[PDB]
Amino acid sequence: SGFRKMAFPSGKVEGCMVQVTCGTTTLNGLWLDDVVYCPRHVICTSEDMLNPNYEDLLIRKSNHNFLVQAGNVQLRVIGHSMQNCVLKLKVDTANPKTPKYKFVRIQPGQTFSVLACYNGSPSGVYQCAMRPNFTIKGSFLNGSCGSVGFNIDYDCVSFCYMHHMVLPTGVHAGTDLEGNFYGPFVDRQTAQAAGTDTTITVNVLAWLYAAVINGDRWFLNRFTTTLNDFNLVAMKYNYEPLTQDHVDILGPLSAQTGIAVLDMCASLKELLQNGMNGRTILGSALLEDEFTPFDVVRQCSG
Amino acid sequence: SGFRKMAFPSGKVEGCMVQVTCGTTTLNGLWLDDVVYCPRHVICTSEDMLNPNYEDLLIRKSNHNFLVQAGNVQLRVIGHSMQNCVLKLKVDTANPKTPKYKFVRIQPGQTFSVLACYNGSPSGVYQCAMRPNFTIKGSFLNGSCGSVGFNIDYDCVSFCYMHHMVLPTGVHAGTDLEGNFYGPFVDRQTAQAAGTDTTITVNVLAWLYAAVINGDRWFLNRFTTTLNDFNLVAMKYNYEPLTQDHVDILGPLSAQTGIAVLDMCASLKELLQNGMNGRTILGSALLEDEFTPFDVVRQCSG
Numbered sequence: 001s002g003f004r005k006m007a008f009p010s011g012k013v014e015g016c017m018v019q020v021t022c023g024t025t026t027l028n029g030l031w032l033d034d035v036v037y038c039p040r041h042v043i044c045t046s047e048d049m050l051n052p053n054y055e056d057l058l059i060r061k062s063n064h065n066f067l068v069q070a071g072n073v074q075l076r077v078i079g080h081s082m083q084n085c086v087l088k089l090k091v092d093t094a095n096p097k098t099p100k101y102k103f104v105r106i107q108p109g110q111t112f113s114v115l116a117c118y119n120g121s122p123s124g125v126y127q128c129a130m131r132p133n134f135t136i137k138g139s140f141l142n143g144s145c146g147s148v149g150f151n152i153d154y155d156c157v158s159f160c161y162m163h164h165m166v167l168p169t170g171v172h173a174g175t176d177l178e179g180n181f182y183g184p185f186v187d188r189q190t191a192q193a194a195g196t197d198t199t200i201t202v203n204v205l206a207w208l209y210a211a212v213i214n215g216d217r218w219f220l221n222r223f224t225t226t227l228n229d230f231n232l233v234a235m236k237y238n239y240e241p242l243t244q245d246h247v248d249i250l251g252p253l254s255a256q257t258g259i260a261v262l263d264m265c266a267s268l269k270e271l272l273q274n275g276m277n278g279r280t281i282l283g284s285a286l287l288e289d290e291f292t293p294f295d296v297v298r299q300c301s302g
Numbered sequence: 303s304g305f306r307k308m309a310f311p312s313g314k315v316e317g318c319m320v321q322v323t324c325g326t327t328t329l330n331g332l333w334l335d336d337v338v339y340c341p342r343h344v345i346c347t348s349e350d351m352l353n354p355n356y357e358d359l360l361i362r363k364s365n366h367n368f369l370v371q372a373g374n375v376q377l378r379v380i381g382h383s384m385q386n387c388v389l390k391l392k393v394d395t396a397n398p399k400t401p402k403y404k405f406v407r408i409q410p411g412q413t414f415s416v417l418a419c420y421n422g423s424p425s426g427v428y429q430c431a432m433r434p435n436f437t438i439k440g441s442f443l444n445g446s447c448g449s450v451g452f453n454i455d456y457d458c459v460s461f462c463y464m465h466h467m468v469l470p471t472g473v474h475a476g477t478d479l480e481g482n483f484y485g486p487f488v489d490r491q492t493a494q495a496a497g498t499d500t501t502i503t504v505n506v507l508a509w510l511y512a513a514v515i516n517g518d519r520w521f522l523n524r525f526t527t528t529l530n531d532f533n534l535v536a537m538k539y540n541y542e543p544l545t546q547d548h549v550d551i552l553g554p555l556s557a558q559t560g561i562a563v564l565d566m567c568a569s570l571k572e573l574l575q576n577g578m579n580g581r582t583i584l585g586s587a588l589l590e591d592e593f594t595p596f597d598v599v600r601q602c603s604g
């Protein structure tokens with residue numbers, strides 16, 4: 001009963017957050033086994049930020065002046081292997097709270113929970129999605145850098161996101177944990193295109209399959225359409241093309257619900273050209289597209 | 303940058319969740335020091351649920367047949383003091399993870415995070431509010447009972463909510479941790495009025511003060527009104543009266559922002575009669591009222 005934007009419990013990650021300081025900039029790190037992960041630009045001294053030289057700093061910079069803190073427990077630094085845009089510090093102590101964990105790259109449309117931190121301490125958790133343009137609509141301030149996004153797969157923490165920067169439109173770009181940016185972004189202060197964002201067609205459908213479940217079923221209509229026609233409706237309405245995979249994934253829902261994906265497709269396109277008239281689906285006057293088919297199911301079976 | 307519905311980190315509570323079984327019903331408990339808290343109707347055997355006798359069960363029921371589990375660690379039961387609608391079991395072991403913690407009653411309009419659990423294990427966290435009618439719009443299924451709502455005050459966990467039941471409209475009622483229901487609700491299967499819910503005027507204002515901050519400022523208008531006139535606008539639009547306290551709390555925002563509360567009041571009432579034309583404030587086509595003035599500030603200063 002009810003249907004909410006809902007993040008994974010943050011406990012298993014909370015135990016991995018630490019502070020990382022270097023001169024003028026302190027930001028967050030992730031303490032996994034005997035290594036700690038942070039955005040490499042922890043070594044930038046502003047100035048550098050206009051167009052930096054992360055080769056001609058990394059090796060030229062020394063362990064000692066990297067102040068790692070695990071609350072107070074000032075972790076004893078060792079290594080400094082740089083992977084892309086992450087800086088990985090091996091440390092004398094290994095994490096006793098280290099959860100069963102994993103580094104993963106997510107595709108656009110997938111969601112994760114974000115645990116937003118400052119000075120190595122968490123302030124809160126929210127769920128967002130990798131946008132088609134490879135941005136995320138998150139909530140970050142000064143010091144949020146190194147904050148991480150994650151899924152939990154039973155007792156297993158899949159880490160997908162580390163936060164690096166804000167983009168023109170108050171949206172956010174960051175890397176995976178092997179330090180490669182989502183989207184064509186660099187850690188530098190240049191004019192970077194956000195990109196024109198599509199709506200995640202499948203996620204909006206899965207949302208309506210969550211509605212009908214939770215009794216709200218008014219939007220429903222007396223028509224149907226084709227996977228082709230639909231798509232060309234999508235296009236003027238900046239909806240990602242819908243694909244056979246997308247259909248085959250909306251099955252397990254469309255199944256239980258009765259309603260076949262292609263009716264919901266018409267039920268949807270009706271809403272797209274018509275307006276919403278100021279009525280609301282699951283307490284929203286807008287089409288929500290940050291819920292994966294999967295997201296729905298876990299919030300309808302623990 | 304950005305603005306999200308955001309829950310407190312769940313770590314400190316996760317360590318307090320346990321399973322509580324009695325015959326046909328297993329649900330969640332809260333393990334604080336050497337006592338564990340759960341909804342008293344863990345002892346109901348259906349049937350009872352039509353109109354129960356929690357006097358003529360509590361004492362008549364025996365410790366041993368209460369199966370408390372802390373993961374596997376089958377906690378050794380002792381006590382059975384019943385406070386209102388909670389059943390409090392003292393146990394041989396005290397919680398080493400017991401956080402600095404506190405039992406508190408929240409007023410309508412205030413928010414808390416919910417950590418929704420099944421079989422004593424958490425599935426996710428979301429933020430919701432005590433609705434004026436004393437309901438909450440949450441996301442709960444079978445086994446969610448005993449799930450708790452909370453705020454965190456630095457290292458201090460204020461517990462406000464324990465979940466008991468669903469109401470007509472797919473909304474939720476539950477107690478404080480001293481076992482007294484929010485609203486006029488009872489743990490029994492009778493026809494219970496949800497109640498007609500107002501919109502939390504102050505929270506909707508604090509939301510707009512969060513908008514302007516995060517650059518979205520279009521809604522803004524060329525007028526003003528009075529605290530009186532406004533209120534009588536509120537009334538047809540089911541907005542709670544606005545009060546001097548409500549004003550004095552929107553200060554610290556209205557301050558930093560420049561804009562004085564009474565302009566935003568006109569800026570608001572314009573939106574109320576006019577429609578939203580299908581444009582959006584902070585990625586919402588509806589007036590959001592589950593953000594306290596406080597909620598905004600912490601998400602603009604860690």
Ligand SMILES: *[C@@](O)(C(=O)NCc1ccccc1)[C@H](C[C@H]1CCNC1=O)NC(=O)[C@H](CC1CC1)n1cccc(NC(=O)OC(C)(C)C)c1=O
Nearest residue numbers: 026041140141142143144145164165166167168187188189
């Ligand atoms: C990180 O938090 C960070 O790298 N800085 C940590 C810090 C900052 C102040 C004091 C102590 C520690 C931020 C993300 C923050 C910034 C404001 N809101 C956030 O979400 N990342 C950056 O500052 C980032 C660094 C880049 C090398 C990778 N960055 C630098 C310069 C300019 C921008 N963006 C910006 O203002 O441009 C737009 C596109 C107009 C928004 C930037 O993100």
Ligand SMILES: *[C@@](O)(C(=O)NCc1ccccc1)[C@H](C[C@H]1CCNC1=O)NC(=O)[C@H](CC1CC1)n1cccc(NC(=O)OC(C)(C)C)c1=O
Nearest residue numbers: 328343442443444445446447466467468469470489490491
């Ligand atoms: C709790 O989870 C619970 O008490 N039951 C735990 C349980 C259930 C099945 C198997 C194992 C353990 C639920 C809350 C759940 C129920 C479905 N969605 C939820 O949020 N609470 C109740 O079941 C509650 C117990 C009352 C004594 C306090 N309860 C009982 C009967 C009827 C209702 N509500 C209902 O269906 O009525 C409405 C108003 C039409 C919705 C109820 O909530």
